[PDB]
């Protein structure tokens, strides 16, 4: 019944962290068109943990595990902002 | 010694490719900038979630 609800909860956050790494690497490889496609999914995955609540009875160990995914997502997002600004500057120069 | 008409066609064709290329860059700039602003909001939400996940 609800061992399913714990893994689903875990998977929701792991997906967010996954897509966050995907975005970062796509930016690192200069794949800007794919990045913008992937962005769509990333935002949808954030919406998912807004629509669904942390279930009751998640243990400390699992909360710690998920907190790790949230931190990793923040770290990636921070790195990504720098690469984005750089690209925006690159593009302004090209645009003229 | 190519015809003027022929040179003018090439000129306009290359000019159109430049326009299309610059249009593309502007669209990409706008969307990446939008994305960057959106990361500000998501980071703010994620920071809240981290602290909530850590409580108790």
From Swiss-Prot, chain A:
Q: Where is this region: FliD binding?
A: 62-96
Stretches for region Required for homodimerization: 3-52
Cellular component annotations (GO), alphabetically ordered: cytosol
Q: Where in the cell is it found?
A: Cytoplasm, Cytosol
Q: Which UniProt keywords apply?
A: Bacterial flagellum biogenesis, Chaperone, Cytoplasm, Repressor, Transcription, Transcription regulation
Q: Name one GO molecular function term.
A: identical protein binding
Q: Name one GO biological process term.
A: negative regulation of bacterial-type flagellum assembly
Assembly and oligomerization: Homodimer. Interacts with FliD and FlhC.
Record organism:
Salmonella typhimurium (strain LT2 / SGSC1412 / ATCC 700720)
Region of the whole protein represented: 1 to 94 of 122
* Stated name of the protein: Flagellar protein FliT
What domain of life does the UniProt record list for this protein's source?
Bacteria
Belongs to which family? Answer: Belongs to the FliT family.
Leader peptide range in chain numbering: none
> Its function?
Dual-function protein that regulates the transcription of class 2 flagellar operons and that also acts as an export chaperone for the filament-capping protein FliD. As a transcriptional regulator, acts as an anti-FlhDC factor; it directly binds FlhC, thus inhibiting the binding of the FlhC/FlhD complex to class 2 promoters, resulting in decreased expression of class 2 flagellar operons. As a chaperone, effects FliD transition to the membrane by preventing its premature polymerization, and by directing it to the export apparatus.
UniProtKB/Swiss-Prot annotation, chain B:
**Where, by residue number, does the polypeptide cross the bilayer?**
none
Stretches of the chain forming a coiled coil according to its record: 1-28
**Localization per record:** Secreted; Bacterial flagellum
Tell me how this protein assembles: Homopentamer.
Family note = Belongs to the FliD family.
Task performed by this protein? Required for the morphogenesis and for the elongation of the flagellar filament by facilitating polymerization of the flagellin monomers at the tip of growing filament. Forms a capping structure, which prevents flagellin subunits (transported through the central channel of the flagellum) from leaking out without polymerization at the distal end.
What's the protein here called? Answer: Flagellar hook-associated protein 2
**Lineage of the species this protein comes from:** Bacteria, Pseudomonadati, Pseudomonadota, Gammaproteobacteria, Enterobacterales
Q: Which residues of the whole protein does the chain here span? A: 412 to 467 of 467
């Amino acid at each position: 019944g609800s061992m399913t609800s714990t893994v689903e909860f875990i998977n929701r956050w792991q997906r967010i962290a996954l897509l966050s790494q995907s975005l970062l690497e796509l930016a690192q490889r200069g794949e800007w068109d794919l990045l913008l496609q992937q962005e769509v999914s990333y935002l949808q995955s954030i919406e998912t943990v807004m629509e669904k609540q942390t279930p009751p009875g998640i243990t400390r160990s699992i909360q710690d595990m998920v907190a790790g995914y949230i931190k990793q997502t923040l770290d990636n997002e921070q790195l990504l902002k720098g690469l984005l600004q750089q690209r925006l500057d690159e593009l302004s120069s090209l645009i003229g | 010694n190519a015809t003027l008409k022929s040179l003018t066609k090439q000129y306009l064709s290359v000019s159109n490719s430049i326009d299309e290329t610059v249009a593309r860059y502007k669209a990409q700039f706008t969307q990446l900038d939008t994305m960057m602003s959106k990361l500000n909001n998501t980071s703010s939400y994620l920071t809240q979630q981290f602290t909530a996940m850590n409580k108790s």
